[PDB]
Symmetry: C3
Subunit: 68 residues, 3 copies
Amino acid sequence: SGIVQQQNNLLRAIEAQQHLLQATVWGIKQLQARSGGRGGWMEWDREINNYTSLIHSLIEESQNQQEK
Amino acid sequence: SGIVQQQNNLLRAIEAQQHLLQATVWGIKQLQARSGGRGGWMEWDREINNYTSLIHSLIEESQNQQEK
Amino acid sequence: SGIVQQQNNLLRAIEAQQHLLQATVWGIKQLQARSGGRGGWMEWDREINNYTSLIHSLIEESQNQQEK
């Protein structure tokens, strides 16, 4: 199954990009900390965290269905 | 078709990550607004918007070919 | 193979999102340059660059296995 191995490849790419996205978000948080504090960013944090949970969920789902 | 359902899973992950990317971009825009204004960021906005159109396009394409 | 063409579609989406991610990272770097310099961001740069290499690698891998 070149298709299956390829699907794992795409999943790994998404996983890697998620890590990149997380580091990018962290970069922004550090900037916010300088420039203004982070109190006004609670809802933004929530949106990002929620999307992260959604993505992690989909990765697990892919691994779950991959697995048997 | 575990392969097809799995492909939808990957598409959903990309869709979710796009939402995350969009929120992340918004975070940067707010920072730019403080720190310097946004006049010098028109071309950057254009590049991001263009890539967003490209991505939205690919999502629709995937859904289009999914569909029948 | 609607599945194969669809897999290319997903790969293209990831490729496009990578370009978006790269532009987003650049946006943050410019902000850091104003607000504080970039000396303290060497390790962050390294993490992002490393994840970018990992992603580029997976794209090539997908294209490699696509190809024959």
